[PDB]
Write an enzyme that holds these catalytic residues in place. Structure first.
Site, PDB file in Angstrom:
ATOM      1  N   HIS A 257      21.076  25.350  82.813  1.00  0.00           N
ATOM      2  CA  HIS A 257      20.181  24.207  82.633  1.00  0.00           C
ATOM      3  C   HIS A 257      19.776  23.500  83.899  1.00  0.00           C
ATOM      4  O   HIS A 257      19.254  22.386  83.890  1.00  0.00           O
ATOM      5  CB  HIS A 257      20.606  23.254  81.492  1.00  0.00           C
ATOM      6  CG  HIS A 257      20.710  23.965  80.193  1.00  0.00           C
ATOM      7  ND1 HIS A 257      19.624  24.564  79.531  1.00  0.00           N
ATOM      8  CD2 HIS A 257      21.777  24.161  79.370  1.00  0.00           C
ATOM      9  CE1 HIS A 257      20.063  25.125  78.405  1.00  0.00           C
ATOM     10  NE2 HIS A 257      21.376  24.866  78.289  1.00  0.00           N
TER      11      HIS A 257
ATOM     12  N   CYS B 189      25.011  22.405  85.814  1.00  0.00           N
ATOM     13  CA  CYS B 189      25.185  23.301  84.682  1.00  0.00           C
ATOM     14  C   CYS B 189      24.290  24.508  84.963  1.00  0.00           C
ATOM     15  O   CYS B 189      23.073  24.380  85.100  1.00  0.00           O
ATOM     16  CB  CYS B 189      24.763  22.571  83.422  1.00  0.00           C
ATOM     17  SG  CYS B 189      24.692  23.704  82.009  1.00  0.00           S
TER      18      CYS B 189
ATOM     19  N   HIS C 251      26.959  25.077  77.813  1.00  0.00           N
ATOM     20  CA  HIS C 251      26.961  24.393  79.102  1.00  0.00           C
ATOM     21  C   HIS C 251      28.093  24.934  79.967  1.00  0.00           C
ATOM     22  O   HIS C 251      29.077  25.473  79.469  1.00  0.00           O
ATOM     23  CB  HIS C 251      27.215  22.885  78.923  1.00  0.00           C
ATOM     24  CG  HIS C 251      26.088  22.168  78.249  1.00  0.00           C
ATOM     25  ND1 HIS C 251      24.802  22.078  78.752  1.00  0.00           N
ATOM     26  CD2 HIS C 251      26.116  21.394  77.165  1.00  0.00           C
ATOM     27  CE1 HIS C 251      24.092  21.328  77.924  1.00  0.00           C
ATOM     28  NE2 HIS C 251      24.849  20.907  76.966  1.00  0.00           N
TER      29      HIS C 251
ATOM     30  N   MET D 175      19.887  19.406  84.762  1.00  0.00           N
ATOM     31  CA  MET D 175      21.274  19.109  84.423  1.00  0.00           C
ATOM     32  C   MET D 175      22.157  19.358  85.621  1.00  0.00           C
ATOM     33  O   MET D 175      22.749  20.407  85.838  1.00  0.00           O
ATOM     34  CB  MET D 175      21.692  19.934  83.196  1.00  0.00           C
ATOM     35  CG  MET D 175      23.029  19.391  82.691  1.00  0.00           C
ATOM     36  SD  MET D 175      23.394  20.070  81.041  1.00  0.00           S
ATOM     37  CE  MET D 175      25.062  19.290  80.857  1.00  0.00           C
TER      38      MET D 175
HETATM   39 CU   LIG Z   1      24.371  22.196  80.580  1.00  0.00          CU
END
Ligand SMILES: [Cu+]
Length: 99
Positions: free
Chosen positions: A87, A84, A37, A92
């Site tokens: 993602h 992120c 992440h 995210m």
């Molecule tokens: Cu992430």
């Protein structure tokens, strides 16, 4: 405020994802599940004049092990959207308001 990177069921989410803080408050982003992440502030969706680089990981930077953190304090008032990078399309994303 503490923010999990990845939920405890594996979901690709910041937990919490929307929240408010005061100036100078720290946000501790903690790698929890589904990493790698990172945390990137959207340069076009933060308070004018804020340098996104002072408050962000670069997009190429990663937290890739459980419990690693990224800490940042925000000072300028207003809404800050973040995501992120690997993602983002999974959803995210988040937004912190400094008030
Ligand atoms: Cu992430």
């Amino acid at each position: 405020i503490d923010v999990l990177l990845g939920a405890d069921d594996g979901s690709l989410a910041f937990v919490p994802s929307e929240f408010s803080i005061s100036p100078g408050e720290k946000i501790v982003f903690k790698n929890n599940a589904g990493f790698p992440h990172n945390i990137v502030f959207d340069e076009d969706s933060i308070p004018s004049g804020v340098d996104a680089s002072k408050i962000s990981m670069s997009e190429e930077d990663l937290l890739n092990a459980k419990g690693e953190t990224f800490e940042v304090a925000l000072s300028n008032k207003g809404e800050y959207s973040f995501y992120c990078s690997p993602h983002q399309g999974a959803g995210m994303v988040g937004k912190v308001t400094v008030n």
